[PDB]
């Protein structure tokens, strides 16, 4: 159908954009040693997560939509890969927000309290949590559990065929998409209050751009899933819209986090 | 006037005779010589461990060991062939601007803006490196320190003077005067009998080590001088300055031989060095790049791009198997 | 520089004791420690090694896994704890220091040793003889052979020359080849090629009488030679 | 292919690297403050009051401060100021008691450098026990005809302070932190601590992009 | 008066010098750098086998 063709085209274009943007960010960080501090550690971790969301989750989404018959467990593997990588990107954003809050609220003791090994420990913990969340479905939460056809080994691979919606709504959205949004919003509000008291609308503009992109890209698909779980009906175009919005956050992150650093802008312009 | 008139007429007639007896420029004589081409030098190794700007660096006599002075107050002795840190000397003063490596290899030295390049002994029976002597007596900041032997070191400071010392006694054997501005660089001759010193007064001058007199003085400059080095035969030297130009003088002909400048170059020079055969001239600028100048043609035969900040110190092996370049980005690089 | 050991004596087979080595007079923390042993009038035999900072620990194939080498930098002391002793474990154990960096003499100083008594692949180097009469002023040439070629790709021939004088512990003379050590008269010299190695002395003096030992450091475990004597 | 000795050389190099990192981490937790000012401008009085080149080390509220006095150098050729990059700030001192014009010229020189564009500057007027007794001999017109304000302490001092502030040729990057409270009380230490704290917070924020 | 007398005397010492024409000096440097050319790695890099780095 025309909707499917448009979905494929927009998805592939957005994935290419994300690939190029995050490759450029990593390139810039690695060429110039002056940009190898804590903030750029967080930024490169986010770039890695977004590259994962761009190179795999895009072809994986295209394949999952087409509904090929690839056996139950390969399909579940693909969906779990999707979740691990998306939640890795979300956790990178959350870690960046917490790091900014620590800088604002620690003051002098920042560089003293946050060392390289602690930063790597935090990044590894975030990525491990993402892996655990996205690979949990293989350990029982899957539509094989409640399906009455226990002899089903080959079936068309549709995301609604293997991934139970109760998990995708109650667990993914309400514990690892919405909580990051709430915590980041509260943290950015406190950061703005503190900086205003110390001193400025450039700061608020940047924070609101961050929050608006994240929410506008992650709430649509989450609400679509929440509606689909509650027996509702949603046009296919709306589902494509939500998916494209998340995978467009993929490429939107580099323009809102790495490009607000003066040094990064100078290096990018120089290259 | 008699003293002013005598000084003026003297200077005038000496300079007029020098100009008249001058035959031709260095470039005029080497026209039939072909360029050396593009001197492409890849970073075969990179020394990491400094956590501040690099101000100075000196090669050892065996052409394998390095020593580098850094703003963080650490003097590190490297093994170039393997990038091993042979020694790590914690300096007393974090403000270091120059040093040297003893020809025998037994001693390395410095202090800093405290007006001293204090001496350290390497081959001690305790296995570590210790401060042998601290040569005090200079009043201005210290610009260079070069060993004549294991018991004789010559020093240049910002007081417009250079001092020759006796390390064992610790008393400055002789003191050299004549400069009007801060002295910024000196180079020891191959035979350790003479040396040339450059100063902020825009004048470089050759000073003898034995008699203590000013054998000669050099001028023909606009701004202060930052770097100076001998041609490997000790029969000439090259200079570097904030004017963004480097100049080659001959201590015999008394006249500046060539100029090393290009229009695109707008910033000064921090260090200078020569190839083993004196065929490639290396200067470290503030433009974040080090240019390889053909000392006979003055054209840019190559650039050691790869430094993310000001190139402060250079060096070359005694056998000429490599080039070390330092910069404010805290990274030394051995090139070849 | 003073390396003094202790903790020796008599021990029955199957017993346990602890050797100790107290170093004082140099930067012990930057120096790696070797352990060497010498059986009664038989020769030397390498024992163990602990590198600077306790980063590397090796042991002799003879006692590997039985014995241990321990370091205490803050207290400037070294230990060698021995678990179960056979009748062959009688020997005089030495404490040796070593620092490895380009140009270093990694076996500059030896200790005074300690004695232990018990009741009743690898590169092999063989010494040509065990005694050679000579008079002062008549040049001599000690030598020993080796199985492998100690000449590493670094260009360094990792062969040493120690001289054990009567009633005194060994003493470095050459640390790679002809590289005279600290406090050694310049008359001594060392030379060789790959497998055949020789130590030359000109204008001998009364203090050159003893046993010569040639040790190899190319690969572990380290191995000594039989021991060549000079008769006077 | 490594020998039994080159491996120990590598271990020595790794240990030296560990020591370098653990000392540099300490060296990056220390506040560096270049101290400048004309003769008898309270520089000596300030270094005494505050808790070749001369270094003064002190700790206040868990911060390690390094204040570098370079008044010994008798050459006015600025061949070492560039070595003072990265210093958290500067402390330029002036006395109310044409010395004032020389102090203003030096302040303009320090502000206009290419080396101190990103570094705040802390102008001090600490003493307040002799800054009022001499005002009555003549207004601020001995060499400053322009001033036509009230011949009172607060007005003239504020006018001098604003004239010093106006010297900042680029207010976008740096900020001038001023002090007038008497030197007798222990407020000069607290003020520099607040100024360095603010500069540290702004440096941190500008690293993220928030600034 | 001695302050300038010593300066002029130093200028006089700088005057009485066995001056050598600039062309002669140039030939000296050119010949010296021509003689030590074959043994200059920076100008003619050594084959990788002998290259210690
Ligand atoms: N109802 C759905 N249909 C298709 N894909 C989905 C659905 N919910 C989540 N996903 C996939 O999971 C990813 C993150 O939850 C989305 O990018 C998308 O590819």
């Amino acid at each position: 159908s025309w909707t499917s063709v448009t979905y494929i085209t927009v998805e592939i274009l957005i994935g290419l954009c994300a690939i190029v943007g995050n490759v450029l960010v990593i390139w810039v960080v690695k060429l110039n040693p002056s940009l190898q501090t804590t903030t750029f550690y967080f930024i490169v971790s986010l770039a890695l997560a977004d590259i994962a969301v761009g190179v795999l989750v895009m072809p994986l989404a295209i394949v999952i939509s087409l509904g090929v018959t690839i056996h139950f467990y390969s399909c579940l593997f693909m969906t779990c890969l999707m979740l691990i990588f998306t939640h890795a990107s979300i956790m990178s954003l959350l870690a960046i927000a917490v790091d900014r809050y620590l800088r604002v609220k620690l003051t002098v003791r920042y560089r003293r309290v946050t060392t390289q090994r602690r930063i790597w420990l935090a990044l590894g913990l975030c990525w491990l949590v993402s892996f655990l969340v996205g690979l949990t479905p293989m350990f029982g939460w899957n539509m094989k559990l409640s399906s009455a056809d226990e002899n089903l080994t080959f079936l068309p691979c549709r995301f609604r065929s293997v991934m139970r919606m109760d998990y995708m709504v109650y667990f993914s959205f309400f514990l690892w998409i919405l909580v990051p949004l709430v915590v980041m919003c509260a943290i950015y509000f406190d950061i703005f209050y503190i900086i205003r008291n110390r001193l400025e609308f450039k700061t608020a503009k940047s924070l609101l751009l961050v929050l608006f992109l994240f929410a506008l890209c992650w709430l649509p698909l989450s609400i679509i899933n929440c509606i689909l779980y509650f027996d509702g009906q949603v046009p296919q175009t709306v589902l494509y819209l939500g998916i494209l919005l998340s995978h467009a956050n993929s490429m939107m992150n580099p323009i809102v986090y790495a490009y607000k650093i003066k040094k990064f802008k100078e290096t990018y312009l120089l290259i | 006037d008699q003293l002013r008139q005598e000084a003026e007429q003297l200077k005038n007639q000496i300079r007029d005779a020098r100009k008249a007896c001058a035959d031709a420029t260095l470039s005029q004589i080497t026209n039939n010589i072909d360029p050396v081409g593009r001197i492409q030098m890849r970073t075969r190794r990179t020394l990491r461990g400094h956590l501040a700007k690099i101000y100075a660096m000196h090669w050892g006599t065996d052409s394998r060991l390095l020593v580098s002075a850094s703003q963080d107050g650490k003097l590190i002795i490297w093994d170039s062939y393997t990038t091993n840190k042979v020694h790590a000397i914690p300096l007393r003063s974090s403000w270091v601007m120059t040093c040297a490596y003893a020809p025998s290899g037994n001693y390395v030295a410095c202090g800093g803006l405290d007006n001293i390049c204090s001496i350290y002994n390497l081959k001690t029976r305790e296995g570590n490196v210790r401060v042998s002597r601290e040569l005090a007596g200079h009043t201005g900041y210290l610009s260079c320190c070069r060993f004549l032997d294991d018991n004789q070191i010559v020093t240049s400071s910002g007081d417009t003077t250079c001092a020759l010392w006796d390390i064992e006694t610790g008393q400055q054997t002789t003191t050299f005067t004549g400069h009007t501005g801060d002295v910024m660089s000196l180079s020891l001759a191959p035979d350790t009998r003479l040396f040339v010193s450059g100063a902020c007064d825009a004048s470089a001058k050759l000073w003898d080590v034995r008699e203590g007199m000013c054998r000669q003085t050099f001028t023909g400059h606009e701004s202060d001088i930052n770097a100076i080095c001998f041609f490997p035969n000790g029969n000439a030297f090259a200079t570097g300055s904030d004017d963004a130009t480097c100049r080659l003088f001959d201590l015999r002909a008394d006249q500046e031989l060539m100029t090393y400048s290009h229009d695109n170059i707008i910033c000064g020079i921090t260090s200078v060095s020569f190839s083993k055969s004196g065929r490639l001239l290396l200067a470290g600028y503030d433009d974040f790049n080090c240019n390889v100048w053909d000392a006979l043609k003055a054209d840019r035969a190559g650039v050691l791009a790869g430094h993310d900040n000001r190139v402060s110190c250079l060096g070359v092996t005694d056998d000429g198997m490599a080039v070390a370049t330092g910069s404010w980005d805290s990274f030394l690089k051995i090139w070849n | 520089v003073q390396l003094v050991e202790s903790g020796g004596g008599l021990v029955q087979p199957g017993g346990s004791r602890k050797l100790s080595c107290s170093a004082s007079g140099f930067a012990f923390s930057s120096f790696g420690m070797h352990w060497v042993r010498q059986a009664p009038e038989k020769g030397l035999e390498w024992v163990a090694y602990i590198s600077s900072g306790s980063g590397t620990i090796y042991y002799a194939d003879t006692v590997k896994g039985r014995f241990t080498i321990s370091r205490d930098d803050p207290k400037n002391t070294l230990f060698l704890q021995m678990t179960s002793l056979r009748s062959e474990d009688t020997a005089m154990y030495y404490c040796v220091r070593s620092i490895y960096y380009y140009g270093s003499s990694p076996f500059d100083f030896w200790g005074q040793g300690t004695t232990l008594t018990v009741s009743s692949s690898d590169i092999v180097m063989t010494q040509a003889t065990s005694s050679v009469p000579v008079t002062p002023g008549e040049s001599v040439s000690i030598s020993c052979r080796s199985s492998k070629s100690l000449l590493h790709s670094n260009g360094n021939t990792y062969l040493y020359w120690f001289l054990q004088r009567p009633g005194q512990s060994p003493q470095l003379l050459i640390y790679r080849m002809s590289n005279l050590a600290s406090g050694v008269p310049d008359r001594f010299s060392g030379s060789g090629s790959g497998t055949a190695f020789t130590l030359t002395i000109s204008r001998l003096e009364a203090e050159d009488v003893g046993v010569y030992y040639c040790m190899q450091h190319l690969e572990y475990p380290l191995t000594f030679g039989a021991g060549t004597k000079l008769e006077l | 292919t490594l020998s039994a000795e080159d491996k120990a050389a590598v271990e020595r190099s790794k240990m030296i690297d560990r020591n370098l990192r653990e000392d540099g981490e300490k060296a990056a937790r220390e506040v560096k403050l270049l101290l400048l000012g004309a003769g008898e401008s309270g520089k000596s009085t300030i270094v005494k009051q505050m808790k070749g080149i001369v270094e003064t080390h002190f700790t206040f509220k868990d911060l390690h401060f390094k204040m570098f006095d370079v008044g010994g150098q008798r050459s006015e050729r600025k061949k070492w100021i560039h070595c003072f990059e990265g210093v958290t700030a500067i402390i330029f001192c002036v006395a109310l008691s044409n010395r004032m014009h020389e102090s203003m010229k030096l302040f303009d020189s320090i502000c206009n450098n290419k080396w101190f564009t990103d570094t705040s500057i802390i102008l001090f007027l600490n003493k307040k026990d002799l800054f009022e007794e001499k005002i009555k001999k003549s207004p601020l017109t001995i060499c400053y005809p322009e001033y036509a304000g009230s011949n009172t302490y607060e007005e003239a001092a504020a006018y001098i302070q604003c004239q010093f502030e106006d010297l900042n040729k680029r207010k976008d990057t740096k900020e001038i932190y001023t002090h007038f409270t008497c030197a007798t009380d222990t407020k000069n230490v607290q003020f520099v601590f607040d100024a360095v704290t603010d500069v540290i917070i702004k440096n941190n924020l500008k690293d993220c992009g928030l600034f």
Side-chain angles (χ1 to χ4, degrees), chain A, chain B, chain C, chain D:
Chain A
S1 55
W2 274 17
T3 55
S4 288
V5 164
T6 291
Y7 179 42
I8 294 165
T9 294
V10 178
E11 187 71 31
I12 186 167
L13 291 165
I14 283 163
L16 267 297
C17 295
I19 287 162
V20 165
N22 285 301
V23 159
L24 287 171
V25 159
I26 292 299
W27 185 249
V28 164
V29 170
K30 295 318 183 192
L31 275 69
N32 269 25
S34 63
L35 308 170
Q36 304 212 351
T37 69
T38 62
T39 189
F40 291 97
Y41 278 21
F42 286 114
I43 290 166
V44 299
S45 70
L46 186 144
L48 266 73
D50 295 354
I51 297 169
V53 169
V55 65
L56 271 163
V57 178
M58 151 194 91
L60 271 193
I62 299 176
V63 169
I64 291 296
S65 83
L66 294 178
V68 183
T69 48
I70 62 170
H71 194 80
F72 178 87
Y73 280 113
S74 296
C75 197
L76 199 64
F77 180 75
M78 295 177 184
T79 70
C80 281
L81 284 186
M82 302 214 169
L83 301 185
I84 55 172
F85 300 138
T86 61
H87 285 99
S89 59
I90 283 155
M91 290 294 335
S92 305
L93 294 164
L94 171 48
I96 291 162
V98 177
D99 171 72
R100 287 176 175 177
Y101 189 53
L102 284 182
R103 298 166 165 290
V104 160
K105 211 78 202 162
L106 279 185
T107 69
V108 285
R109 313 194 303 290
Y110 173 73
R111 287 176 313 241
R112 178 201 171 167
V113 165
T114 300
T115 55
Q116 279 186 358
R117 269 148 182 181
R118 255 176 63 104
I119 293 156
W120 285 133
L121 188 146
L123 279 175
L125 179 58
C126 292
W127 274 78
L128 175 67
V129 163
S130 307
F131 262 77
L132 183 154
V133 159
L135 281 167
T136 298
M138 287 168 189
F139 297 76
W141 278 333
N142 46 5
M143 293 177 70
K144 183 74 191 177
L145 183 63
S146 286
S147 294
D149 275 307
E150 286 77 22
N151 309 321
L152 206 67
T153 53
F154 293 165
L155 60 88
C157 169
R158 286 177 213 297
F159 190 104
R160 294 282 291 298
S161 291
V162 298
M163 310 278 272
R164 291 194 64 186
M165 274 292 122
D166 61 359
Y167 156 85
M168 277 295 294
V169 174
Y170 279 123
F171 198 64
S172 181
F173 172 44
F174 170 62
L175 271 72
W176 307 103
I177 297 169
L178 199 63
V179 168
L181 188 39
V182 170
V183 70
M184 295 158 45
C185 203
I187 296 169
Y188 284 166
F189 173 63
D190 213 28
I191 286 168
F192 178 66
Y193 162 76
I194 298 156
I195 190 167
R196 177 266 301 290
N197 188 2
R198 170 156 297 282
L199 270 166
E200 57 155 359
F201 294 136
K202 184 160 207 182
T203 294
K205 171 196 152 58
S206 293
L207 299 205
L208 290 190
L209 188 68
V210 163
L211 270 167
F212 171 79
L213 282 175
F214 181 81
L216 180 85
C217 280
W218 271 116
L219 269 168
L221 183 56
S222 286
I223 293 173
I224 288 165
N225 282 313
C226 199
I227 276 169
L228 289 168
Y229 158 82
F230 276 113
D231 315 296
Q233 310 264 310
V234 171
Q236 191 51 243
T237 307
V238 163
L239 186 66
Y240 294 159
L241 184 68
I243 298 168
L244 294 169
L245 287 175
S246 177
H247 305 175
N249 178 1
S250 182
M251 60 144 288
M252 278 296 176
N253 269 349
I255 297 89
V256 175
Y257 271 106
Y259 182 76
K260 313 296 276 288
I261 298 90
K262 172 173 288 194
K263 292 181 181 179
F264 191 107
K265 294 170 48 56
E266 310 203 5
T267 61
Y268 169 76
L269 294 170
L270 289 162
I271 295 164
Chain B
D1 58 335
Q2 62 95 21
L3 60 94
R4 314 282 173 66
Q5 158 56 18
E6 282 290 81
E8 190 68 4
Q9 68 89 9
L10 275 176
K11 277 310 311 180
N12 280 117
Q13 70 90 23
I14 294 90
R15 289 199 182 289
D16 178 19
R18 190 193 314 182
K19 168 54 59 186
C21 299
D23 297 339
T25 58
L26 185 53
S27 64
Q28 187 69 359
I29 304 301
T30 188
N31 192 6
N32 55 345
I33 308 301
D34 57 353
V36 297
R38 311 178 40 268
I39 298 314
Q40 194 94 70
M41 297 174 70
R42 281 82 57 84
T43 306
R44 296 297 185 90
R45 292 181 183 273
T46 288
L47 314 181
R48 306 170 167 96
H50 285 290
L51 286 159
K53 306 160 177 45
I54 302 301
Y55 286 122
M57 179 275 308
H58 206 249
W59 271 101
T61 300
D62 59 341
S63 298
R64 172 165 189 169
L65 281 160
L66 278 298
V67 69
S68 70
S70 179
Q71 192 212 21
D72 64 311
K74 305 298 317 309
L75 189 70
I76 291 174
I77 297 169
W78 310 77
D79 186 346
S80 79
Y81 295 162
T82 300
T83 62
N84 296 122
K85 282 169 196 66
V86 183
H87 289 289
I89 308 104
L91 304 169
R92 188 46 62 233
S93 86
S94 179
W95 314 105
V96 285
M97 293 177 70
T98 190
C99 294
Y101 196 85
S104 67
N106 296 115
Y107 297 102
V108 295
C110 293
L113 291 178
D114 201 358
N115 305 337
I116 308 156
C117 178
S118 304
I119 303 188
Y120 305 85
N121 185 18
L122 294 186
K123 322 285 184 54
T124 61
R125 65 193 281 240
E126 276 97 357
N128 53 25
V129 180
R130 272 318 306 151
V131 178
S132 66
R133 297 301 303 264
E134 284 202 309
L135 299 167
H138 274 303
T139 302
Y141 82 92
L142 183 64
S143 298
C144 186
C145 80
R146 291 300 201 241
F147 278 95
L148 294 174
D149 284 278
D150 57 1
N151 203 50
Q152 211 154 348
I153 185 162
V154 60
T155 292
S156 163
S157 181
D159 194 3
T160 77
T161 59
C162 293
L164 173 81
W165 306 74
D166 172 79
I167 302 171
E168 179 47 285
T169 52
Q171 313 324 100
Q172 51 196 5
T173 300
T174 300
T175 305
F176 296 180
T177 61
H179 276 307
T180 61
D182 293 18
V183 194
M184 271 290 290
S185 196
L186 68 80
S187 184
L188 281 193
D191 63 22
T192 62
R193 274 221 171 220
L194 304 170
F195 71 102
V196 295
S197 198
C200 278
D201 72 342
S203 80
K205 38 180 67 177
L206 164 63
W207 286 348
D208 188 298
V209 177
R210 314 184 90 71
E211 290 81 2
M213 72 202 160
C214 189
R215 173 141 290 191
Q216 213 194 320
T217 193
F218 309 98
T219 66
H221 205 286
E222 294 293 328
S223 190
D224 58 358
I225 300 173
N226 311 296
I228 196 163
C229 175
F230 276 103
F231 199 66
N233 66 2
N235 287 349
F237 69 96
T239 311
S241 293
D242 288 334
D243 196 354
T245 300
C246 283
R247 307 182 184 265
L248 184 141
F249 305 90
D250 191 82
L251 73 165
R252 322 193 305 180
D254 296 332
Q255 191 170 18
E256 184 187 356
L257 274 176
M258 271 276 308
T259 63
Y260 296 122
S261 192
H262 179 66
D263 198 5
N264 296 115
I265 314 290
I266 315 298
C267 55
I269 301 93
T270 61
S271 62
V272 176
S273 297
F274 277 80
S275 170
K276 176 181 178 180
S277 303
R279 174 58 170 165
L280 305 176
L281 172 43
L282 288 80
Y285 298 75
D286 316 300
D287 208 307
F288 301 170
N289 300 345
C290 175
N291 294 74
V292 172
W293 299 92
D294 206 305
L296 301 188
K297 316 300 207 71
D299 291 331
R300 301 181 280 101
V303 176
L304 277 72
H307 274 297
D308 182 324
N309 206 343
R310 175 169 297 187
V311 172
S312 44
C313 61
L314 294 175
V316 183
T317 61
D318 296 66
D319 57 1
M321 210 82 67
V323 167
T325 72
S327 288
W328 292 29
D329 50 344
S330 306
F331 296 123
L332 260 173
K333 279 171 170 255
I334 297 89
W335 309 69
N336 175 37
Chain C
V1 298
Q2 199 192 0
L3 277 164
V4 173
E5 306 97 337
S6 67
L10 63 95
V11 64
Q12 285 300 309
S16 70
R17 295 166 57 78
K18 191 161 73 139
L19 289 187
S20 300
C21 174
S22 66
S24 66
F26 62 105
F28 182 76
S29 289
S30 66
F31 267 95
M33 299 278 102
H34 302 261
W35 274 103
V36 172
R37 72 174 182 171
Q38 170 176 58
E41 66 270 356
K42 286 212 292 156
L44 273 55
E45 172 179 354
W46 175 75
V47 169
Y49 160 52
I50 184 155
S51 84
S52 71
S54 303
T56 296
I57 295 176
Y58 294 156
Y59 289 102
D61 295 328
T62 300
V63 299
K64 182 159 201 301
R66 51 160 299 250
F67 279 6
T68 183
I69 193 168
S70 159
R71 178 84 72 83
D72 190 3
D73 285 0
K75 291 276 160 224
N76 294 278
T77 312
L78 177 75
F79 311 102
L80 188 77
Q81 166 56 60
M82 294 182 286
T83 72
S84 68
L85 273 67
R86 291 86 165 105
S87 59
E88 180 268 359
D89 292 301
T90 184
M92 159 196 289
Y93 291 94
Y94 293 120
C95 187
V96 184
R97 73 165 205 198
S98 162
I99 201 163
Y100 304 89
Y101 62 77
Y102 167 78
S104 188
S105 78
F107 270 79
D108 209 327
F109 194 60
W110 279 65
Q112 283 301 61
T114 188
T115 187
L116 195 71
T117 316
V118 298
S119 170
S120 289
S121 49
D122 296 8
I123 300 168
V124 169
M125 295 182 287
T126 79
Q127 282 210 357
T129 182
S130 177
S131 173
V132 163
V134 58
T135 55
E138 313 291 343
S139 306
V140 64
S141 165
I142 301 279
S143 69
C144 66
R145 284 181 211 181
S146 74
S147 163
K148 296 188 67 181
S149 178
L150 292 176
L151 187 145
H152 203 267
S153 293
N154 310 130
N156 289 313
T157 311
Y158 299 127
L159 172 45
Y160 306 160
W161 283 108
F162 307 165
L163 172 66
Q164 181 160 45
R165 284 171 188 123
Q168 292 154 49
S169 65
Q171 195 211 52
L172 181 50
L173 315 174
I174 308 294
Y175 62 93
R176 274 171 200 100
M177 294 183 286
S178 78
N179 308 352
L180 196 74
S182 173
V184 176
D186 66 338
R187 61 178 154 277
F188 289 88
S189 162
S191 54
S193 55
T195 66
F197 304 101
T198 184
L199 185 76
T200 72
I201 308 90
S202 300
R203 324 211 201 171
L204 311 93
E205 270 89 7
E207 315 324 327
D208 297 336
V209 306
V211 187
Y212 292 69
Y213 299 119
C214 67
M215 202 197 87
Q216 63 91 43
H217 216 284
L218 185 72
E219 293 162 347
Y220 275 91
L222 312 169
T223 49
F224 296 76
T228 304
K229 198 176 64 172
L230 291 181
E231 268 286 347
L232 187 153
Chain D
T1 304
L2 282 193
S3 59
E5 303 185 358
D6 291 331
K7 296 187 177 109
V10 167
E11 292 181 354
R12 190 171 163 81
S13 312
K14 297 297 159 65
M15 273 276 284
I16 283 163
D17 292 341
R18 279 218 287 288
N19 283 117
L20 290 172
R21 280 197 283 265
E22 69 90 18
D23 69 38
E25 281 193 56
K26 172 187 153 171
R29 296 162 34 153
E30 290 171 338
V31 170
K32 290 202 313 195
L33 296 164
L34 175 55
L35 169 66
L36 283 153
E40 295 296 316
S41 295
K43 172 203 282 295
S44 302
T45 295
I46 282 291
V47 300
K48 282 193 70 168
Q49 204 66 232
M50 185 180 288
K51 175 67 188 62
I53 190 167
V54 182
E55 293 179 353
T56 303
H57 296 62
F58 60 105
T59 304
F60 196 69
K61 296 318 183 261
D62 206 357
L63 294 174
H64 273 277
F65 288 101
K66 288 183 172 174
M67 187 167 51
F68 314 116
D69 178 337
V70 298
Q73 287 287 137
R74 292 152 156 181
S75 63
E76 279 84 20
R77 204 56 171 71
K78 56 89 170 180
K79 301 296 284 163
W80 56 101
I81 51 162
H82 63 94
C83 304
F84 279 100
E85 269 198 20
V87 299
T88 298
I90 313 187
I91 296 169
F92 192 101
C93 299
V94 176
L96 182 75
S97 306
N98 55 4
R99 309 296 176 90
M100 294 299 291
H101 288 65
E102 214 66 6
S103 308
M104 295 187 135
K105 178 174 47 54
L106 270 297
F107 203 108
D108 198 334
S109 59
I110 74 165
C111 293
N112 197 2
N113 296 118
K114 69 163 84 70
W115 302 122
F116 278 131
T117 78
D118 310 331
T119 72
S120 287
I121 283 165
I122 309 184
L123 182 63
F124 268 104
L125 290 92
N126 53 351
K127 297 172 184 74
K128 204 188 90 195
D129 290 352
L130 198 78
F131 284 30
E132 291 85 3
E133 277 67 8
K134 81 177 290 175
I135 291 173
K136 277 75 69 171
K137 78 178 80 177
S138 280
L140 188 71
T141 65
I142 62 182
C143 294
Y144 194 83
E146 298 290 348
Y147 179 62
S150 184
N151 56 359
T152 60
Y153 157 63
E154 196 273 328
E155 203 77 18
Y159 189 85
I160 286 166
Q161 184 177 2
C162 293
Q163 276 267 318
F164 268 108
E165 295 275 331
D166 213 8
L167 294 174
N168 190 353
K169 215 192 295 286
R170 49 202 63 72
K171 301 182 172 61
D172 301 347
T173 61
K174 65 159 63 45
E175 170 162 359
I176 307 298
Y177 307 73
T178 191
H179 198 73
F180 266 72
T181 302
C182 186
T184 53
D185 186 357
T186 60
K187 317 215 169 59
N188 199 304
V189 176
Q190 184 72 9
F191 184 91
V192 296
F193 172 71
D194 303 355
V196 285
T197 300
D198 193 64
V199 185
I200 284 298
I201 289 162
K202 289 188 165 71
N203 297 132
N204 276 334
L205 268 44
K206 180 142 57 200
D207 207 52
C208 295
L210 297 163
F211 200 82

